[PDB]
């Protein structure tokens with residue numbers, strides 16, 4: 694994925710174990726939470742590179758299958774929409790965990806069976822005040838609440 698070298702202003706404080714998902718306070722690990730100035734925190738993989746004719750490190754927002762973590766995200770996003778996680782949701786393109794980081798996930802934009810998070814979809818609804826648009830496959834449960842209060 695997108696890679697960026699560590700800058701001296703980065704204050705890396707959180708590492709996550711790839712398979713187990715254990716979070717620990719540390720400055721250094723294979724998967725670390727990186728917050729580039731202004732940007733959302735992201736879990737990034739340390740990768741070996743050649744840069745300016747020398748061996749080095751960089752950090753890349755690479756895909757990570759979080760199934761073995763055995764814990765759910767607080768939000769997910771895919772196909773240009775970000776939604777709260779509701780139990781029953783499928784894995785989307787990225788997952789946000791409550792300690793505070795996005796993970797590049799292994800899913801897509803199918804939120805439930807036959808229900809896609811699609812900006813050009815046919816159903817508008819909300820989850821906890823957050824607006825979303827769904828595309829439904831051809832009864833069908835709508836996994837969200839009406840916009841009317």
Ligand SMILES: *[C@@H]1O[C@H](CO)[C@@H](O[C@@H]2O[C@H](CO)[C@@H](O)[C@H](O)[C@H]2NC(C)=O)[C@H](O)[C@H]1NC(C)=O
Pocket residue numbers: 694695754755756786787797798
């Ligand atoms: C999640 O990570 C994957 C790689 O693990 C990213 O996919 C690659 O993105 C780069 C550009 O950044 C392309 O050159 C590659 O062809 C893509 N595929 C692979 C298999 O490497 C993906 O873009 C990342 N997703 C997000 C949302 O950042």
Ligand SMILES: *[C@@H]1O[C@H](CO)[C@@H](O)[C@H](O)[C@H]1NC(C)=O
Pocket residue numbers: 758759760761799800
């Ligand atoms: C992620 O891992 C789980 C457990 O091994 C597996 O069932 C699932 O298919 C994996 N997802 C992808 C996209 O490989």
Ligand SMILES: *[C@@H]1O[C@H](CO)[C@@H](O)[C@H](O)[C@H]1NC(C)=O
Pocket residue numbers: 820821838
């Ligand atoms: C979001 O809404 C659902 C259903 O309306 C509810 O079950 C859930 O507790 C809400 N979550 C929060 C954080 O309010």
